[PDB]
């Protein structure tokens, strides 16, 4: 038939790994992003961007190695290898943090390709595409945290660097400079994630503990056959159990699974809204009434004020080394301390 | 006065939980 038809037939072949049309975008972008992350964590340094060593070659381990964000002198530049910053020089491109931009961009396009892959495969198996809508959660997380937040900030420098200790630094930095725990959208995100973990554990235990005795063996994993029209566990027994233990219980399996889908997705989207708010420093950092009460009453103290003091200490004691481009020099006298208070 | 609003919201939530527990739609086999 037509070239398209033949190419569509070949891409849709039942192989070990489905390729599809979405594969043409997913496989190269994802492969390049992963390989660039490995290359950065193995060879590329962060000495000229953050003043840090972040490579196995420099002596870092799995936790401390990272693909660090570009230098604060770059701004929100695409940092193309052929761009005016690098001008085709691979060494200077790696030294200025261009590999982080490479990984971030090709990884965003890889996430788009994987979402399209979920859509394509759902259209072939003939099922509703409730995947690639669940994956919209992680997509929103990545877009808000690694793309929208640095774009709202001064440069790519304040984006999370692709590493374990780098991610921990990013957590503490955001807590210090934004008080992100106090953000209600982050609270909804935490509630969503913890509730999703709760739902996963409780649903697994409930199904495992309400199975029908469909086998004579003590180990009951064999009593489930792959094409089973009958239900393998008692929904009525599980309903009665939770109705009389917790006071409320699921009666519709459909609803239950949609709820288990909905909770983490809603949590991730709320956290994404909160991070988008943080991108412009539009943060729920402080309560004005509490600050006014503490200002006119030195004997008034709450855990919120202690958190404010902790955030101030974090900012003051991490600014010098976390933002070396600013050339912050803070004398010991102006550094906040508990005794200094 | 905001303490009154906070207490009102908390007891309203507790009452909603109470009514959801003891006045739910009774499950039946169809």
């Amino acid at each position: 038939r037509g070239w398209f038809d033949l190419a569509d037939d070949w891409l849709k072949r039942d192989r070990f790994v489905f390729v599809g049309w979405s594969g043409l975008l997913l496989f190269p972008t994802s492969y390049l992003s992963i390989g660039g992350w490995f290359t950065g964590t193995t060879f590329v340094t962060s000495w000229y961007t953050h003043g840090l060593a972040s490579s196995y070659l420099e002596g870092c381990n799995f936790f401390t190695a990272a693909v660090s964000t570009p230098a604060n002198s770059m701004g929100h530049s695409l940092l193309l290898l052929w761009g005016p910053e690098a001008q085709g020089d691979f060494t200077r491109w790696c030294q200025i943090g261009g590999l982080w931009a490479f990984c971030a961009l090709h990884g965003s396009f890889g996430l788009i390709g994987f979402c399209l892959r979920q859509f394509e495969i759902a259209r072939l198996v003939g099922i509703r595409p409730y995947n690639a809508i669940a994956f919209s959660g992680p997509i929103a997380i990545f877009v808000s945290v690694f793309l929208m937040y640095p774009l709202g900030q001064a440069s790519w420098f304040f984006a999370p660097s692709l590493g374990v200790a780098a991610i921990f630094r990013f957590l503490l930095f955001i807590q210090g400079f934004h008080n992100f725990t106090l953000n209600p959208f982050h609270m909804m995100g935490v509630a969503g994630i913890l509730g999703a973990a709760l739902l996963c554990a409780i649903h697994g235990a409930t199904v495992q503990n309400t199975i029908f005795e469909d086998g004579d063996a003590a180990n009951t994993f064999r009593a489930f056959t792959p094409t089973q029209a009958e239900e393998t566990y008692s929904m009525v027994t599980a309903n009665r159990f939770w109705s009389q233990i917790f006071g409320v219980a699921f009666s519709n399996k459909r609803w239950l699974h949609f709820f288990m889908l909905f909770v983490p997705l809603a949590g991730l989207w709320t956290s994404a809204i909160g991070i988008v708010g943080l991108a412009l420093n539009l943060r729920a950092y402080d309560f004005v009434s509490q600050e006014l009460r503490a200002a006119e009453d030195p004997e008034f103290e709450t855990f919120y004020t202690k958190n404010i003091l902790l955030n101030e200490g974090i900012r003051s004691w991490m600014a010098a080394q976390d933002q070396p481009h600013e050339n912050f020099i803070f004398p010991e006298e102006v550094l906040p301390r508990g005794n200094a208070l | 006065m905001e303490t009154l609003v906070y207490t009102f919201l908390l007891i309203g939530t507790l009452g909603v939980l109470f009514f959801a527990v003891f006045f739910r739609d009774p499950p039946r086999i169809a």
């Binding site: 009434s289 009460r293 | 006065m1 905001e2 609003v5 919201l9 309203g12």
Partner: protein, 36 residues
């Protein structure tokens, strides 16, 4: 030293969605009772 419209926002954003849900539920129960 709290705000003022603050109370208006809290009370209305609590009530407007609550009365909407209650009205919808009462309408559904009315349909169920009328049909049965």
């Amino acid at each position: 030293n709290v705000s003022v419209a603050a109370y208006l926002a809290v009370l209305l954003g609590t009530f407007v969605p609550v009365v909407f849900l209650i009205t919808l539920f009462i309408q559904s129960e009315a349909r169920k009772a009328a049909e049965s």
